Design a protein around this motif. Structure first.
Motif, mmCIF file in Angstrom:
data_model
loop_
_atom_site.group_PDB
_atom_site.id
_atom_site.type_symbol
_atom_site.label_atom_id
_atom_site.label_comp_id
_atom_site.label_asym_id
_atom_site.label_seq_id
_atom_site.Cartn_x
_atom_site.Cartn_y
_atom_site.Cartn_z
ATOM 1 N N UNK A 77 64.565 40.342 44.178
ATOM 2 C CA UNK A 77 63.645 40.698 43.077
ATOM 3 C C UNK A 77 62.792 39.524 42.659
ATOM 4 N N UNK A 78 61.972 39.736 41.643
ATOM 5 C CA UNK A 78 61.135 38.708 41.047
ATOM 6 C C UNK A 78 61.797 38.195 39.776
ATOM 7 N N UNK A 79 61.487 36.954 39.414
ATOM 8 C CA UNK A 79 62.138 36.275 38.302
ATOM 9 C C UNK A 79 61.149 35.954 37.188
ATOM 10 N N UNK A 80 61.674 35.814 35.971
ATOM 11 C CA UNK A 80 60.860 35.477 34.809
ATOM 12 C C UNK A 80 60.776 33.961 34.649
ATOM 13 N N UNK A 81 59.640 33.499 34.159
ATOM 14 C CA UNK A 81 59.412 32.075 33.924
ATOM 15 C C UNK A 81 60.417 31.541 32.904
ATOM 16 N N UNK A 82 61.187 30.496 33.220
ATOM 17 C CA UNK A 82 62.182 30.014 32.245
ATOM 18 C C UNK A 82 61.570 29.473 30.965
ATOM 19 N N UNK A 83 60.580 28.595 31.087
ATOM 20 C CA UNK A 83 59.903 28.064 29.911
ATOM 21 C C UNK A 83 59.332 29.183 29.052
ATOM 22 N N UNK A 84 58.628 30.120 29.685
ATOM 23 C CA UNK A 84 58.053 31.225 28.946
ATOM 24 C C UNK A 84 59.089 32.015 28.179
ATOM 25 N N UNK A 85 60.149 32.459 28.855
ATOM 26 C CA UNK A 85 61.123 33.258 28.130
ATOM 27 C C UNK A 85 61.783 32.453 27.027
ATOM 28 N N UNK A 86 61.781 31.127 27.118
ATOM 29 C CA UNK A 86 62.495 30.334 26.130
ATOM 30 C C UNK A 86 61.635 29.852 24.962
ATOM 31 N N UNK A 87 60.310 29.985 25.011
ATOM 32 C CA UNK A 87 59.490 29.537 23.881
ATOM 33 C C UNK A 87 59.950 30.180 22.584
ATOM 34 N N UNK A 88 60.088 29.362 21.549
ATOM 35 C CA UNK A 88 60.470 29.824 20.242
ATOM 36 C C UNK A 88 61.956 29.861 19.987
ATOM 37 N N UNK A 89 62.776 29.763 21.027
ATOM 38 C CA UNK A 89 64.222 29.735 20.883
ATOM 39 C C UNK A 89 64.765 28.321 21.016
ATOM 40 N N UNK A 90 64.485 27.648 22.131
ATOM 41 C CA UNK A 90 64.966 26.286 22.348
ATOM 42 C C UNK A 90 63.862 25.392 22.890
ATOM 43 N N UNK A 91 62.690 25.933 23.124
ATOM 44 C CA UNK A 91 61.620 25.158 23.727
ATOM 45 C C UNK A 91 60.376 25.156 22.844
ATOM 46 N N UNK A 92 59.639 24.052 22.781
ATOM 47 C CA UNK A 92 58.422 24.000 21.973
ATOM 48 C C UNK A 92 57.154 24.260 22.778
ATOM 49 N N UNK A 93 56.048 24.354 22.054
ATOM 50 C CA UNK A 93 54.735 24.606 22.623
ATOM 51 C C UNK A 93 54.068 23.294 23.012
ATOM 52 N N UNK A 94 53.044 23.392 23.849
ATOM 53 C CA UNK A 94 52.272 22.236 24.273
ATOM 54 C C UNK A 94 50.986 22.051 23.479
ATOM 55 N N UNK A 95 50.525 23.081 22.774
ATOM 56 C CA UNK A 95 49.370 22.987 21.893
ATOM 57 C C UNK A 95 49.762 23.516 20.526
ATOM 58 N N UNK A 96 49.300 22.833 19.482
ATOM 59 C CA UNK A 96 49.601 23.235 18.111
ATOM 60 C C UNK A 96 48.302 23.215 17.308
ATOM 61 N N UNK A 97 47.825 24.390 16.911
ATOM 62 C CA UNK A 97 46.768 24.462 15.912
ATOM 63 C C UNK A 97 46.538 25.902 15.498
ATOM 64 N N UNK A 98 45.814 26.052 14.396
ATOM 65 C CA UNK A 98 45.386 27.344 13.896
ATOM 66 C C UNK A 98 43.875 27.462 14.001
ATOM 67 N N UNK A 99 43.411 28.635 14.416
ATOM 68 C CA UNK A 99 41.991 28.925 14.513
ATOM 69 C C UNK A 99 41.796 30.423 14.352
ATOM 70 N N UNK A 100 40.551 30.823 14.131
ATOM 71 C CA UNK A 100 40.197 32.225 14.019
ATOM 72 C C UNK A 100 39.470 32.673 15.285
ATOM 73 N N UNK A 101 39.030 33.930 15.272
ATOM 74 C CA UNK A 101 38.531 34.554 16.487
ATOM 75 C C UNK A 101 37.266 33.885 17.002
ATOM 76 N N UNK A 102 36.458 33.295 16.128
ATOM 77 C CA UNK A 102 35.202 32.711 16.570
ATOM 78 C C UNK A 102 35.350 31.285 17.088
ATOM 79 N N UNK A 103 36.548 30.701 17.015
ATOM 80 C CA UNK A 103 36.814 29.373 17.551
ATOM 81 C C UNK A 103 37.884 29.347 18.631
#
Lengths: 50, 100, 206, 151
Positions: free
Chosen positions: C1-27
């Motif tokens: 079968x095919x496998x799920x990305x480990x980093x992806x499935x783990x974001x928000x549980x034990x792994x952090x993001x690589x970009x941090x910011x807030x923006x709206x739809x026009x930015x």
RNA sequence: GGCCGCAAGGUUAAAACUCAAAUGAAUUGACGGGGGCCCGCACAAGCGGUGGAGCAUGUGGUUUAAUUCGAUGCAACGCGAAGAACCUUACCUGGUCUUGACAUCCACGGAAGUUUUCAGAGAUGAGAAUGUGCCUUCGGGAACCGUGAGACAGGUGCUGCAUGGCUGUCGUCAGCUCGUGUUGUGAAAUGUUGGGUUAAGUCCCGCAACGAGCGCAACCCUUAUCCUUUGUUGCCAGCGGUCCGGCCGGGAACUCAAAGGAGACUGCCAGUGAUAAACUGGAGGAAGGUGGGGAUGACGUCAAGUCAUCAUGGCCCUUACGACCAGGGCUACACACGUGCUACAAUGGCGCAUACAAAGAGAAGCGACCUCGCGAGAGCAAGCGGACCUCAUAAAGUGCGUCGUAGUCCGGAUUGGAGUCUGCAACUCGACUCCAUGAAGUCGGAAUCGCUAGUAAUCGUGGAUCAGAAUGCCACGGUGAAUACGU
């Protein structure tokens, strides 16, 4: 999620946006300067209304 | 996508930016009621002498990294494939896999 | 079968993001494209300085970039004569004031991106893939990991029929979401085509 | 199923009277999730029927059922390459269910003006021992009797 | 050929020619119209459909200058396409250029705003106005418009049987393996089999085995019950004003919003069982034995799919298989198949008037109140980057009339005439409105599909793509069944 035909086999994603509101009833000049001279994190959006 | 299609897109956006106000004026003239009824004819006959590529409806949204003309999302500027790649790598703030 | 990305499935549980910011739809779209161009330039410029991670933040109306590297001297240079140049170019690309920070990787042998880069580099100079893979596994298990897995695929040794091979040692539990798993990949360009490499490293539950 | 035990769902009693049999009758009559229409039809029919016989609606209904309840039926078996009709006994819940199903099926096939009218006519004929429902019961019993050798 | 026999035949017994094997006993699998045990909407018990009609959409074939390319048993056929009038476009007919439509180099001079003529346009020619900043130690040329020469650029051109990356399927099935030890000359075996038990190689007891890994379960999201913090734009039981309305003074109690916590574990009782693992009942409790729904896809199989997202070895074309333009085609029509929508009617069609939701989107955006139009819409104009304003009036339901079993006061294909809007531009080839016309069809042969509970059936509402173009795709609530003896 496939580069070609297969039409089932999708992925679903979400973005969540959290929001808070704070009210100040009786201000003074020193306080308003104190607020306007504050810094916060690199991922929060702040709007001030008078 | 071929290297000439992207060039076509750049040309289109440039001309649309250039001729923006003239067209709005001519179209307000043609639309407005109680006009001289010959100024209408003149404005209609002049709106079609401008370059065709200056109309905003000749433009096609494309992926900013590859050029794909299908599967476009507006919030991200990318197609489904590149959206998924960046999402799994961790480059889209706040996005994650959902269940409910 | 095919496998799920480990980093992806783990974001928000034990792994952090690589970009941090807030923006709206026009930015949102413009910010993403600017980040992409920044990373492209830095990765081309620092090809020999052992870069493993680039983190971007956008506070107020400026940009600050943190680089995770294993040879910080080659990046900083003689009293900053290279960091300054990098900052100027990044400011030009971003369109706002810029800041750069440099953080050090203590152990390059427990880092997923660096192991994979080393294997690809060896493969491009005609080394034997079995030797490369075994050396990687032994180093990792010697310096303290709880488990490691390595995988390689393509036209190995110049063969006409492509193939895939892997080695493992220790525990590597992929279905456990509280497990701290590091994952990354790399590609090698040879005279017979492309060869692909993947690496998994386990460090403990949390 | 293969390895299951399924419990019984509870059913509310009727609002006007208080019988669960009549609730099941409404359920068997309904279509597309419209319970109000079915209740209207059943109540009107029982109203027009109580007169024609001078007894309570419940008594008319019970007497109508008692002539359509079956006793023995036939199942199909095929192990030797041939189909055999084996007679079996029917149990009470199935008796009631089959009676109700046949009554409604016969009603829908008539040619009067309103559904309530058709239902009332069918119930009266049943109480008099005539109609398609009683014909069906007789046919089932005949088939069961003709195959007594395979019990 | 000899001997023997009435005959049928028996007995003794060669060569030419041709192949590189024929054969015995054991080992791991796969298979059996061999045996034993157990699962699953597999069957059985039930409810609604497809196959027949009209229309929407995809595919085969045939046609054409072209009808661009790809997907082909289950696991291709509302599939890549989450949106072909020009653009998109990769196809056809004709008009055009050659270091080039997109880049880096060298050296010869100067730049962007309007406005005229011949062109279908691409592209040719005439004019008018301007003189930027900046060490000018004069070299800046950075910024960006012209032309000339050659190292080069360019290719949706072939091979998915040279590849990376990504995906389908057996299958959310319970399996798949290693180290040391022991057995056999060996291929291999044991462990992983056996007695019980579970959704489960789940767990216990036995046993030449003793241990560990990938899977199973648990940790993650959501839903159902409680309490403690903050109470505006969200909420009104007590109190008091009345223009009746959460309107107003107030209140922090209740709905609700969203952060920290509690709770469910065979924990307690009785019976069966190997003095076990477990099973069947009962108490309390919102919930009971995996409470309900998601995410999560082992070693491998099909030289399975994709060089047309992208990347990449080898081959191939360079005044052309690379640029630019206006028209056409992808929408054709004797015919065959898949997936859907609307119906063939009284549990209904039409007219009046009246309860009750959930989840979403919005600056070149969503567009109220008012006026005009029979209507699709038009004019003028507040509010809102939003628990505040707008889109936005739920429908099935309930009450009162009428129709009276008819190809109908059922159904709404087709066609004539007149309009509105988006857009440079609706002939080929768009959506919607008004008057008129009123086709097939009365429940569908052999076959064949979905579904075990807030499910099937039935009624409405929102979003992505998007100038405009859903009966398709992804989401939300309302009413609410029948049946499971059994293998």
């Amino acid at each position: 999620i496939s580069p070609h035909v297969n039409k089932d086999a999708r992925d679903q994603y979400e973005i969540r946006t959290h929001l808070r509101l704070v009210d100040i009833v009786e201000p003074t000049e020193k306080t308003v300067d104190a607020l306007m001279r504050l810094d916060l994190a690199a991922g929060v959006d702040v709007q001030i209304s008078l | 996508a071929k290297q000439s299609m992207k060039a076509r897109e750049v040309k289109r956006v440039a001309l649309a930016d250039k001729y923006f106000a003239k067209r709005a004026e001519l179209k307000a003239i043609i639309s407005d009621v109680n006009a001289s009824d010959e100024d209408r004819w003149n404005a209609v006959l002049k709106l079609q002498t401008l370059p065709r590529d200056s109309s905003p409806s000749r433009q096609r949204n494309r992926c900013r990294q590859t050029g794909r003309p299908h599967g476009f999302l507006r919030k991200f500027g990318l197609s489904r494939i590149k959206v998924r790649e960046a999402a799994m790598r961790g480059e889209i703030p706040g996005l994650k896999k959902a269940s409910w | 079968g095919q496998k799920v990305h480990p980093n992806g499935i783990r974001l928000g549980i034990v792994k952090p993001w690589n970009s941090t910011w807030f923006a709206n739809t026009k930015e949102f779209a413009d910010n993403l494209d600017s980040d992409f161009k920044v990373r492209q330039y830095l990765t081309k410029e620092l090809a020999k300085a052992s870069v493993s991670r680039i983190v971007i933040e956008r506070p107020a109306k400026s940009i600050r970039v943190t680089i995770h590297t294993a040879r910080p001297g080659i990046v900083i240079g003689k009293k900053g004569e290279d960091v300054e140049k990098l900052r100027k170019v990044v400011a030009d690309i971003a369109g706002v004031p810029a800041q750069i920070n440099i953080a050090e990787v203590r152990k390059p042998e427990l880092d997923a991106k660096l192991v994979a880069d080393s294997i690809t580099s060896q493969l491009e100079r005609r080394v034997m893939f079995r030797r490369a893979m075994k050396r990687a596994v032994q180093n990792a298990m010697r310096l303290g990991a709880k488990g490691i897995k390595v995988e390689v695929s393509g036209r190995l040794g110049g063969a006409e029929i492509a193939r895939t091979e892997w080695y493992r040692e220790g525990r590597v539990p992929l279905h456990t979401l509280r497990a701290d798993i590091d994952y990354n990949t790399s590609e090698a360009h040879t005279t017979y085509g492309v060869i692909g490499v993947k690496v998994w490293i386990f460090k403990g539950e949390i | 199923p293969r390895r299951r035990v399924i419990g019984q769902r509870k059913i509310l009693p009727d609002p006007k009277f208080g019988s669960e049999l009549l609730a099941k009758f409404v359920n068997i009559l309904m279509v597309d999730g419209k319970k109000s229409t079915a209740e209207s039809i059943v109540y009107s029919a029982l109203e027009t029927l109580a007169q024609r016989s001078g007894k309570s609606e419940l008594e008319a209904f019970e007497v109508a059922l008692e002539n359509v309840r079956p006793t023995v039926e036939v199942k199909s078996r095929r192990v030797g390459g041939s189909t055999y009709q084996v007679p079996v006994e029917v149990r009470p819940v199935r008796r009631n269910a089959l009676a109700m199903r046949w009554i409604v099926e016969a009603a829908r096939k008539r040619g009067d003006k309103s559904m309530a009218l058709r239902l009332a006519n069918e119930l009266s004929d049943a109480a008099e021992n005539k109609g398609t429902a009683v014909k069906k019961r007789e046919d089932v019993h005949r088939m069961a009797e003709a195959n007594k050798a395979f019990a």
